[PDB]
Amino acid sequence: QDSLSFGFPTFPSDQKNLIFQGDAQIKNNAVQLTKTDSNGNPVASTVGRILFSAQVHLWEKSSSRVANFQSQFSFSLKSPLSNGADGIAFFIAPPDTTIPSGSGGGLLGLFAPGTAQNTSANQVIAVEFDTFYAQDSNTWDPNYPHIGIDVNSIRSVKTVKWDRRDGQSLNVLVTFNPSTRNLDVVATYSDGTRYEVSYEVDVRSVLPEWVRVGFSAASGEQYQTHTLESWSFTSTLLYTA
Amino acid sequence: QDSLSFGFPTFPSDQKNLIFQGDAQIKNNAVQLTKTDSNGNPVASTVGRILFSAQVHLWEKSSSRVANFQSQFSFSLKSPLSNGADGIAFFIAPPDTTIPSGSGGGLLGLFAPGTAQNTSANQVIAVEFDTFYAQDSNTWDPNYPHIGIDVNSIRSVKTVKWDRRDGQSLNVLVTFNPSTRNLDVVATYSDGTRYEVSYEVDVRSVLPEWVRVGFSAASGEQYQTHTLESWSFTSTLLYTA
Ligand SMILES: CO[C@H]1O[C@H](CO[C@H]2O[C@H](CO)[C@@H](O)[C@H](O)[C@@H]2O)[C@@H](O)[C@H](O)[C@@H]1O
Ligand SMILES: CO[C@H]1O[C@H](CO[C@H]2O[C@H](CO)[C@@H](O)[C@H](O)[C@@H]2O)[C@@H](O)[C@H](O)[C@@H]1O
Ligand SMILES: [Ca+2]
Ligand SMILES: [Ca+2]
Ligand SMILES: [Mn+2]
Ligand SMILES: [Mn+2]
């Protein structure tokens, strides 16, 4: 299809079009990307991801069209600690994508250790909400919590300082305009605190014509829950001139 | 998801989200539901169907909601014969639906001979465009080409007279309003000729909560091409009170 859109105001346990990978599962009408114990407390060493089953037609070579898309979602992070880790990310990748071996912790379940910073070895665009930046294990991160745009590497091409608020929902809007090639991210807390980061990228040179979209999250030594509360997505192939 | 929509202004051969059953296949940017030879001519004894891969959430028992949906599409039928057969239908059925054994010809690839008219043995709602009504074989049909609403039986709960026009595209809009439980069908030819038919049905007593939507067509002794040219669909769960 040239256009596709779906919306999950909440996430009832009875799902049919979501691909669950790793420890991701439904709990309390929300998607818990990372594992939690019987009491709902976050645990260490856990990775989880979800992808919508239907493939998205991001661009079409024959017609020279590229899709304009928008993804709106909200999530919250909670942890008994204060150095919750590692983060959640919205991502776009080939349809057959699976959790790379050894991609836990700071690799957010998106990259393999050996090629995490090798742009020519990956095919993925992601918007990460990174809460752990210890320079001994996350050498690629700026020294502070941040939102970043990742293009084929765990080392963001662009970032903005962000504030982690335990238990508060962050509302996010990610937009890609094929006319300007601008991938825009706007995140806001209920009180109006706003964060913005943008970057110009030609999706055609990074991803194949058909892709899948979803979310990934991980916790290594440090942990926190990565709760996806709602999500809507829409994409429309448009002629770019 | 509570809401889902997709649009196929045309059908390029590079498809990822359609389930092809029987002889259905893409040719010349359109879906040929029934088999055609090398020259693109229709042949006898053929059945074919397509279904969008993502499941649609039709109704939800726990929340007492029912989907409001709309399906817009266009097709054309063509045949060198005086009596092209057998017809095409838009349908809704359980997610694991497949072509029943012996459902060719007048059964449109939707029902098995043994239970074609047994409403308690089927789970399907279809809008048929029936061009073959020979009273000796299709005994259940009115004696003329017609548009029919089928609820668990090849014997339409309602039909209206319709004219078959060789090679002309018919545009159809099928709507279901959960508030009134009215399933409306509006079909038009390019010259303005219009056909309307409506029926009240509680979808909750006929179909499971999750379903797949698609098209089906068949040709028995007589034949014709059944070409699906475009299709857009949208559905949204709504509180019914
Ligand atoms: C906690 O520091 C010790 O372990 C470090 C390994 O860090 C893991 O946990 C991080 C946060 O969950 C995660 O970002 C990283 O990928 C690892 O999974 C190590 O680097 C320190 O030197 C120290 O031993
Ligand atoms: C060709 O006529 C002979 O067979 C007929 C069987 O009818 C088949 O074809 C019809 C039109 O394609 C279709 O509606 C039906 O389901 C069968 O597939 C029969 O009716 C005639 O009396 C004759 O024997
Ligand atoms: Ca990090
Ligand atoms: Ca018939
Ligand atoms: Mn980072
Ligand atoms: Mn009929």
Dihedral angle, C-alpha B203, B207, B210, B212, nearest 10 °: -100
CA distance B210 to B206: 12
CA distance B131 to A241: 45
3-state secondary structure of A6: strand
Instruction: Return the bridge partners of B210, or none.
Output: B57
CA distance B115 to B63: 33
3-state secondary structure of A37: coil
In one-letter notation, the amino acid at residue B87 is G
3-state secondary structure of A39: coil
Residues in chain A: 241
Residues in chain B: 241
User: Which residues place a Cβ less than 5 A from the ion ligand 3?
Assistant: A 106, 130, 132, 138, 141
Q: Which residues contact A119 (CB under 8 A, 6 or more apart)?
A: A151, A152, A153
3-state secondary structure of B212: strand
Judging by beta carbons within 10 Å of its beta carbon (0-12, 13-18, 19+), is residue A8 exposed, middle or buried?
buried
The tokens for B53 are 């891969």
Q: State the Cα angle at B51 between B24 and B168, rounded to 5°.
A: 60
Q: Which residues of A touch B210 (CB under 8 A)?
A: 16
Ligand 2 in reach of B45 Cβ (< 6 A): no
- The answer to whether the beta carbons of residues B213 and B207 sit under 8 Å apart is no
Task: Compute CA distances B219 → A114, A180, B56, B106, B167, whole Å.
Answer: 57, 50, 28, 8, 17
Q: Which of A233, A84, A228, A108 is nearest to A173 (CA)?
A: A233
Judging by beta carbons within 10 Å of its beta carbon (0-12, 13-18, 19+), is residue B237 exposed, middle or buried?
buried
Alpha-carbon distance A223 to nearest alpha carbon in chain B (angstroms): 29
CATH architecture under which domain A2-241 falls? Sandwich (2.60)
Q: Which of B45, B91, B36 is nearest to B227 (CA)?
A: B36
Alpha-carbon distance A184 to nearest alpha carbon in chain B (angstroms): 24
Q: Which residues contact A38 (CB under 8 A, 6 or more apart)?
A: none
- The answer to whether the beta carbons of residues A155 and A139 sit under 8 Å apart is no
- The answer to whether the beta carbons of residues B53 and A54 sit under 8 Å apart is yes
Q: Resolution in A, one decimal?
A: 2.0
Task: Compute CA distances A237 → A57, A176, A179, whole Å.
Answer: 8, 12, 11
Q: Give the number of other Cβ atoms within 10 Å of residue B86's Cβ.
A: 31
Q: Is the peptide bond before B166 cis (omega within 30 degrees of 0)?
A: no
CA distance A144 to A151: 20
Q: Which of A227, A87, A88, A216 is nearest to A169 (CA)?
A: A227
Q: Do B7 and A17 touch (CB under 8 A)?
A: no
Query: How was it solved?
Result: X-ray
The tokens for A34 are 């990372």
Helix runs in chain A, H state only:
none
Instruction: Using a CB–CB cutoff of 8 Å, tell me whether B62 touches chain A.
Output: yes
Instruction: Return the bridge partners of A234, or none.
Output: A5, A70
